[PDB]
Design a protein around this ligand. Structure first.
Ligand code: CLA
Ligand code: CLA
Ligand code: CLA
Ligand code: CLA
Ligand code: CLA
Ligand code: CLA
Ligand code: CLA
Ligand SMILES: CCCCCCCCCCCCCCCCCC(=O)OC[C@H](CO[C@@H]1O[C@H](CO)[C@H](O)[C@H](O)[C@H]1O)OC(=O)CCCCCCCCCCCCCCCCC
Ligand SMILES: CCCCCCCCCCCCCCCC(=O)OC[C@H](COP(=O)(O)OC[C@@H](O)CO)OC(=O)CCCCCCCCCCCCCCC
Ligand SMILES: CC1=C(/C=C/C(C)=C/C=C/C(C)=C/C=C/C=C(C)/C=C/C=C(C)/C=C/C2=C(C)CCCC2(C)C)C(C)(C)CCC1
Ligand SMILES: CC1=C(/C=C/C(C)=C/C=C/C(C)=C/C=C/C=C(C)/C=C/C=C(C)/C=C/C2=C(C)CCCC2(C)C)C(C)(C)CCC1
Lengths: 187, 119, 27, 484
């Protein structure tokens, strides 16, 4: 019964499609429609959001712990991403299958590394940024695009992974996924 | 799956015989009418919450997609040497689908013609 | 004896248990 | 002539043949009770009251015999697993035979009343026309019903002269037929208090006797006589059908939600005991106790009774059956022949995981293993590719405590998956399915079948009450309107 007036003819609210989230020692932009989720597929996850439509489009921030002084000590972007294949998800199939079609041998999952790049930031931070297309034998949603932005700060390895469906990707979740990706600042 | 892939035929112009791979008829992501599969599936009959047991391990607890082998003999006749093309007849024997390991395979004998161009 | 432990142990198996549904305004 | 749906109207104005058809109906119902008892005795297996109780065997009237005191058989066995050396006349077969004899006697009385219908008792002494003084008859019947209700509550269920009624512990472990003291306070209106039954029957019998005396004495008023049509037997039929479906709704709700008069040892557990974690909570509290006292986990799970473990199992849920899944629950999932023990799940990291139990709605439910803090840590995935929580990836082992697998630990995923899928249904048991050729699909409990039958009868009787109230109020236009 606390009297507060309604917003009639009150112009607009924030319709930017993004909300600012400041976690512990990082700040990033989340999609406006995505709900937070308590799921932690990696035990060193400090943040997770998922789309109200489907939980295929998700995003998480790994904090973890590292011993290298900088992510540049991981050799290269390719050598850095070769060590995080468990982010993809282990293939639980154990039978030999050469009848899946363009999937090598006994494989029902594949990861095409579309691009590797190095992005250096205003504060001196350098980020490794990764486009990966993971595709399965059934090929759910035409494959899933993974967006990784990682750097080493303090004494920990901050990593951002954004997962989207390819059907969602050409539907128009590519814009919001890249907006999440390009807003990851750790310092 | 009438297939000839990876056929390694040794022999003569009159007849050369060899083996070829016969892939599984269904992929591992194929789902049975009860939604049991290989790469996907429920792994058991879930419409029967107290029946999906070890006496039907062939149907639900295991799904097999092992590739097989097939034999083929080819014979060459009617060769055009000015256009570099060859005709002939072929004789193949290959196994059938094993569902997904639920039944033994039958043997199919395929006779027919074949054609090719060289270089 | 530890009602909090038995509560947090019945909860993941069944969220509709009356121990979880009772006096949880304090939680 | 008459439509086929009006034949029984030929006894509306024939009190003797109305008595005759009532007597025939009573004979048929008593004969059904006796024959059903003999069928259930012939097919009942009493050798294991713990893991094969009567509600696992499709027994419908056997619980109603056991509820009021009949607990022994002429076959030398007691329903509580003891030995009956002198069952007496009032055994299960004795009650069955008494009902058969009663059915025969009522058949003979029905024949007599059909033949000798033209009794001067049914003639009004003033005009000589056939009539029934329905207010006076209701007074007599209400007086008799009050006397019988008072006697049943003051002598049978109190144990003063009768045997008492079935009373159990809250968790259905140590139930027996006991005398019951009346509860005259507010606790007497506790539905689960057994003491409410004698107090209700004593008080309601006294009130029925007083109201029957009132209806014997005081004639109805002319206004209310014409308003309710107390000269027409069809008005009495409509009001009786109304009262009967009211009672049917009451007994259906009481059986479905449980009460002191519907014990779980006789009718099976209720669905709300599974929904609200009744037996699960009791089992876990009994395990938490004696762990603080200083016992290991291998014991204090062997201390858990197999009866309680069987109660904590969704296959005993009355709301997990089907409309055309017929017969005993044993014909559904086998005869339970042993508790395998509690299954504790752990991952490679050593944290304890619990299988998410299947809710009552779900015919099928995904297997999900959740940690202490509510985070899903493992599952049996539908998509075994790019998965992150499979049993193989997480490294889940299972250890059993207290049962036939006590002390055993399984680490292979093929067996961890099946034990997690079984733990989805609650406590894990071994079932003999070859004896009855069980089809592996859950059946319904006798309380569920009772509730379904009585709710359906209650709605159909609501329609019948509407139809007969309509017939009473609109009798003069039953064949048509006046046209003027
Ligand atoms: C078993 C109990 C019982 C029954 C079946 C009756 C039956 C009778 N009583 Mg009654 N009576 C009794 C006990 C009983 N009495 C007791 C305990 C007392 C106190 C001593 C009396 C004292 C009494 C008096 C003083 C009189 C009657 C009379 C009557 C007659 C007409 C009733 C009438 O007009 O209904 C009313 C008409 C109705 C249609 C009632 C229908 C009920 C409602 C509408 C159902 C609605 C349900 C709805 C969905 C809401 C549910 C909500 C929920 C919370 C309840 C009838 C023969 C009268 C008579 O002629 O007797 C000589 C009379 O005047 N009775
Ligand atoms: C209030 C009524 C009632 C209730 C609740 C029960 C309940 C029970 N009886 Mg029972 N019984 C009853 C009256 C009742 N009975 C009577 C009147 C008889 C005499 C005919 C029987 C004879 C009887 C036998 C002989 C047996 C049972 C058994 C059973 C148990 C198994 C479940 C079941 O009913 O089968 C499943 C019930 C159904 C599938 C109900 C059918 C649904 C409706 C009626 C269908 C609609 C009509 C439809 C148009 C018919 C067309 C079909 C046609 C094409 C063939 C259950 C505890 C069994 C048991 O376990 O014995 C120990 C058993 O073998 N009872
Ligand atoms: C209406 C309420 C009612 C109900 C349904 C029950 C039900 C029960 N009572 Mg009872 N009881 C009640 C009221 C009730 N009682 C009251 C008012 C009293 C106080 C008097 C008691 C005191 C009590 C005692 C003292 C005992 C019970 C017991 C029993 C049980 C078996 C006896 C029985 O009824 O068999 C069903 C009976 C019939 C179907 C009647 C059969 C009629 C026969 C066959 C006809 C006559 C035969 C004969 C040959 C006729 C020709 C005569 C010719 C030879 C001259 C049964 C569960 C007994 C027990 O403990 O059981 C283990 C027992 O010993 N009751
Ligand atoms: C010393 C006093 C005493 C004691 C201790 C009791 C104790 C008891 N009486 Mg009571 N009673 C007494 C004297 C006493 N009575 C007297 C003097 C009378 C008058 C004769 C009655 C008349 C009476 C009635 C008529 C009822 C009881 C009931 C009960 C039980 C209440 C708990 C329960 O299970 O309710 C559970 C029952 C209810 C809560 C009834 C709810 C009915 C609702 C309002 C309507 C249901 C039908 C409706 C049309 C819905 C249709 C379907 C819907 C989906 C549309 C308990 C055994 C009830 C009983 O037998 O329960 C099994 C009951 O129905 N008593
Ligand atoms: C001497 C006679 C006698 C006795 C004592 C028995 C004894 C028994 N019969 Mg019964 N029975 C008999 C006659 C008898 N019967 C006759 C005449 C018939 C034909 C109608 C039957 C048909 C019958 C069947 C259908 C069944 C039995 C069953 C039973 C057993 C349990 C009874 C029970 O659960 O009560 C439960 C009884 C009630 C809950 C009735 C309560 C009365 C209602 C509430 C009255 C409501 C209206 C009332 C006028 C309101 C009063 C108002 C108030 C103010 C006073 C028991 C062995 C059962 C069993 O297990 O058999 C194997 C069962 O299924 N009997
Ligand atoms: C105890 C309650 C009761 C009683 C005493 C009556 C009595 C009467 N009804 Mg009925 N009625 C009731 C309940 C009751 N009804 C209910 C519950 C329904 C709704 C389903 C109705 C709806 C109704 C209608 C719509 C009609 C009547 C009519 C009649 C009259 C003739 C019936 C006849 O010849 O049927 C003859 C029936 C047959 C030859 C075969 C019926 C076979 C049925 C469909 C299946 C078998 C039943 C089975 C054997 C019994 C077990 C079920 C039981 C547990 C209930 C008679 C006065 C008629 C009337 O008013 O006439 C003027 C009329 O038209 N009734
Ligand atoms: C759709 C429902 C409905 C309909 C339209 C009928 C129709 C009929 N009833 Mg009734 N009746 C009903 C259901 C119904 N009844 C139910 C559920 C009961 C209880 C068992 C009865 C009990 C009853 C008796 C015993 C008799 C009839 C009779 C009759 C006839 C005369 C009209 C009358 O007295 O109305 C009855 C009046 C009502 C149904 C209105 C009830 C309104 C109540 C008081 C509201 C109370 C609300 C209150 C706040 C409680 C809220 C509870 C909540 C918290 C859960 C007529 C054919 C009488 C007759 O003359 O038949 C020939 C008769 O003898 N009725
Ligand atoms: C034809 C006319 C009868 C129709 C019913 C066919 C039953 C099919 C059958 O074989 O069942 C047969 C089943 C039993 O069937 C067998 O039982 C065995 C143990 O006794 C084993 O468990 C077997 O596995 C099982 O198949 O049950 C019955 O005998 C039916 C009992 C009749 C009463 C049913 C409950 C009443 C419910 C509601 C009452 C009506 C309410 C209003 C309407 C709604
Ligand atoms: C213990 C075992 C007991 C055994 C059971 C015995 C009873 C079995 C028979 C009872 C019912 C008989 C019904 C006769 C039917 C009958 O008598 O004929 C029609 C009947 C005739 O009414 P009248 O008053 O005009 O009849 C005069 C006399 O000739 C009839 O007695 O009308 C009715 O009211 C009855 C029901 C409505 C009729 C419609 C119901 C049928 C529709 C079926 C639809 C199917 C198509 C589906 C397509 C999707
Ligand atoms: C004569 C005589 C005698 C004998 C008797 C007898 C032998 C009886 C019986 C009887 C009987 C033995 C009975 C029974 C019965 C039954 C009934 C009556 C039933 C029924 C049914 C119904 C009604 C049902 C229906 C249904 C169905 C079908 C299914 C489901 C659904 C329903 C439920 C609806 C003596 C010597 C004693 C004495 C002298 C005389
Ligand atoms: C004689 C006489 C009379 C008449 C009466 C009547 C009319 C009666 C009736 C009756 C009736 C009306 C009866 C009925 C019955 C029924 C029964 C007896 C039944 C049954 C059933 C069963 C046994 C079942 C089986 C089964 C099952 C188990 C389930 C389902 C299916 C089947 C079928 C398989 C009068 C009164 C006039 C007079 C006096 C004398």
């Amino acid at each position: 019964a606390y009297g507060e007036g309604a917003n009639v003819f009150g112009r607009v609210t924030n319709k930017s499609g993004f909300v600012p989230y400041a976690g512990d020692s990082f700040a990033l932009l989340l999609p406006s429609k995505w709900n937070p989720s308590d799921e932690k597929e990696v035990d060193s996850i400090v943040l997770r959001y998922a789309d109200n439509f489907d939980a295929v489009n998700n995003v998480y921030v790994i904090a973890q712990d590292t011993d290298k002084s900088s992510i540049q000590d991981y050799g290269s972007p390719e050598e850095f991403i070769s060590q995080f294949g468990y982010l993809l998800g282990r293939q639980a199939w154990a039978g030999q299958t050469v009848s899946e079609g363009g999937f090598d041998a006994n494989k029902v999952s594949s990861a095409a590394l579309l691009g590797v790049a190095t992005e250096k930031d205003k504060k001196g931070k350098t980020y490794y940024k990764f486009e990966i297309l993971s595709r399965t034998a059934d090929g759910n949603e035409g494959g899933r695009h993974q967006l990784v932005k990682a750097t080493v700060s303090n004494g920990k390895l901050y990593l951002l992974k954004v997962q989207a469906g390819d059907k969602r990707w050409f539907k128009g979740t590519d814009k919001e996924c890249l907006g999440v990706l390009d807003s990851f600042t750790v310092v | 799956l009438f297939t000839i892939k990876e056929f390694d035929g040794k022999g003569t112009l009159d007849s050369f015989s060899g083996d070829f791979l016969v892939p599984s008829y269904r992929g591992s992501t194929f789902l049975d009418p009860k939604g049991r599969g290989g790469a996907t599936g429920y792994d058991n009959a879930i419409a029967l919450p107290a029946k999906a047991d070890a006496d039907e391990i062939q149907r639900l607890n295991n799904k097999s997609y092992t590739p097989g082998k097939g034999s083929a003999v080819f014979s060459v006749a009617k060769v055009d040497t000015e256009t570099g093309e060859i005709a002939g007849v072929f004789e193949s024997i290959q196994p059938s689908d094993t569902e997904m390991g639920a039944h033994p395979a039958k043997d199919i004998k395929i006779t027919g013609l074949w054609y090719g161009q060289l270089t | 004896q530890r009602v909090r432990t038995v509560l947090d142990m019945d909860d993941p198996a069944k969220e509709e248990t009356v121990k979880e549904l009772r006096k949880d305004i304090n939680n | 002539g008459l439509p086929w749906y009006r034949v029984h109207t030929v006894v509306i104005n024939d009190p003797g043949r109305l008595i005759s058809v009532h007597l025939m109906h009573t004979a048929l119902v008593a004969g059904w009770a006796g024959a059903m008892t003999l069928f259930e005795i012939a097919v009942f297996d009493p050798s294991d009251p713990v893991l094969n109780p009567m509600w696992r065997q499709g027994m419908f009237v056997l619980p109603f015999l056991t509820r009021l005191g009949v607990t022994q058989s002429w076959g030398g066995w007691t329903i509580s697993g003891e030995t009956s050396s002198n069952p007496g006349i009032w055994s299960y077969e004795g009650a069955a035979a008494s009902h058969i004899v009663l059915s025969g006697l009522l058949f003979l009385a029905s024949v007599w009343h059909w033949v000798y219908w033209d009794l001067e008792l049914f003639r009004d002494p003033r005009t000589g026309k056939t009539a029934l003084d329905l207010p006076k008859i209701f007074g007599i019947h209400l007086f008799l019903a009050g006397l019988l209700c008072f006697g049943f509550g003051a002598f049978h269920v109190t144990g003063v002269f009768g045997p008492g009624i079935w009373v159990s512990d809250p968790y259905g472990l140590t139930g027996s037929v006991q005398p019951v003291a009346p509860s005259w306070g507010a606790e007497g209106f506790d539905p689960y208090n057994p003491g409410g039954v004698p107090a209700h029957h004593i008080a309601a019998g006294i009130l029925g006797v007083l109201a029957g005396l009132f209806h014997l004495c005081v004639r109805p008023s002319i206004r209310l006589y014409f308003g309710l049509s107390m000269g027409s037997i069809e008005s009495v039929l409509s009001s009786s059908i109304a009262a009967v479906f009211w009672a049917a709704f009451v007994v259906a709700g009481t059986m479905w939600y449980g009460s002191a008069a519907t014990p779980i040892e006789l009718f099976g557990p209720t669905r709300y005991q599974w929904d609200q974690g009744f037996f699960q909570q009791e089992i876990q509290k009994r395990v938490a106790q004696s762990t603080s006292e200083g016992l290991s986990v291998s014991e204090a799970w062997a201390k858990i009774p197999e009866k309680l473990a069987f109660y904590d199992y969704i296959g005993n849920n009355p709301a997990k059956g089907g409309l055309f899944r017929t017969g005993a629950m044993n014909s559904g999932d086998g005869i339970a022949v042993g508790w395998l023990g509690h299954a504790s799940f752990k991952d490679q990291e050593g944290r304890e995981l619990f299988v998410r139990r299947m809710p009552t709605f779900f015919e099928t439910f995904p297997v999900v293993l959740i940690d202490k803090d509510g985070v899903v840590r493992a599952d049996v995935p539908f998509r075994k590719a790019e998965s992150k929580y499979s049993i193989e990836q997480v490294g889940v082992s299972v250890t059993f405590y207290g049962g036939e697998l006590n002390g055993l630990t399984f680490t292979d995923p093929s067996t961890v998956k099946k034990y997690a899928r079984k733990a989805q249904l609650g406590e894990i048991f071994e079932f003999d399915r070859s004896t009855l050729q069980s089809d592996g699909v859950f059946r319904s409990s006798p309380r569920g079948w009772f509730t379904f039958g009585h709710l359906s009868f209650a709605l159909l009787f609501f329609f019948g009450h509407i139809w007969h109230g309509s017939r009473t109020i609109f009798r003069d236009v039953f064949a048509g309107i006046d046209e003027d």
